[PDB]
Design a protein around this ligand. Structure first.
Ligand SMILES: [K+]
Length: 118
DNA sequence: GCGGTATGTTTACATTTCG
DNA sequence: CGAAATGTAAACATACCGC
């Protein structure tokens, strides 16, 4: 059973993990599990993808620690969530792709569930 | 009390993306 | 093409855990 590294970006998989929870907040440990559950490649891969995940959570503006026991929880920032909701309800979004990896996951979750968790 | 591990920040360079 | 974004590696801080 061979597995290939999916082309999805780390920020895209993280956004997916946060939107999967009912409260829109999730711990690093559960983000690891979500990735291994939904993308089998990372379940058995030896590379240090967790280092890259942590790098993306801290550096990407869209991800923000919530006070919320080893680690705290992560959610989508209020600025990025409020911004998307305003653009979503004000009309179609631009077809631009550069840097919209998080925006696309919000678009998908919104078109299926009608709301971004919080 | 200490060693060990998990979480989080930050910097640097390589690689891919896409107007 | 190339600025911007993402990928990968690394140094190191901070907190937690189990004894
Ligand atoms: K961040």
């Amino acid at each position: 059973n061979r597995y290939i590294k999916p082309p999805q970006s780390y920020a895209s998989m993280i956004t997916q993990a946060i939107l999967s929870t009912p409260e829109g907040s999730i711990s690093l440990a559960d983000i690891y599990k979500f990735i291994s559950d939904n993308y089998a490649f990372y379940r058995f891969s030896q590379m240090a993808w967790q280092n890259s995940v942590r790098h993306n959570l801290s550096l990407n503006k869209a991800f923000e620690k919530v006070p919320k026991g080893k680690g705290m929880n992560w959610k989508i920032s209020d600025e990025v969530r409020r911004d998307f909701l305003n653009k979503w309800n004000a009309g179609k979004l631009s077809k631009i792709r550069r840097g919209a990896s998080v925006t696309r996951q919000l678009q998908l979750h919104m078109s299926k569930f009608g709301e971004i968790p919080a």
